[PDB]
Ligand binder design. Sequence first.
Ligand SMILES: COc1cccc(-c2c(C(=O)O)ccc3ccc(OC)cc23)c1
Ligand SMILES: COc1cccc(-c2c(C(=O)O)ccc3ccc(OC)cc23)c1
Length: 134
Amino acid sequence: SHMCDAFVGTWKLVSSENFDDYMKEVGVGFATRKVAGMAKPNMIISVNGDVITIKSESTFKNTEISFILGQEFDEVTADDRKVKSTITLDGGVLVHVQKWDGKSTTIKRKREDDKLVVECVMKGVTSTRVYERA
Ligand SMILES: COc1cccc(-c2c(C(=O)O)ccc3ccc(OC)cc23)c1
Ligand SMILES: COc1cccc(-c2c(C(=O)O)ccc3ccc(OC)cc23)c1
């Protein structure tokens, strides 16, 4: 048993708050916000040795990242930003920081009861996305 055991699995989005405004804050245009906002992605988290893989799949877009904790990597986000990302574990929370064009946003992933809770923060705007086991 290891670092991210309680995250591993397939998770389905069930609820969202303030995600349109989060997207606005990160620069997403109107049409992409409206289409992406409908999506109910599946987030599939797996671990192989030190490598964590997070796949996020929806009608809108499929994304896949693999990484080692603390080790920066290139990411193309679902909204097509080209960012430098680092993911760390801080007190049992996966903390995903994305840097691009002098800007920064943080996505936190946390296990809470039987849910996986995702908080996306850009400046003063926070959005919460709640996932259940698929
Ligand atoms: C893979 O399908 C989707 C569907 C819906 C939203 C997202 C998504 C995630 C995510 O769920 O990993 C994280 C961050 C985002 C930031 C901006 C964004 O603008 C469209 C979309 C984001 C991905
Ligand atoms: C790419 O990754 C990072 C990591 C840490 C810091 C920054 C960063 C910040 C920031 O987020 O505080 C602000 C302004 C910057 C201006 C130039 C810059 O050189 C590429 C990096 C800047 C970027």
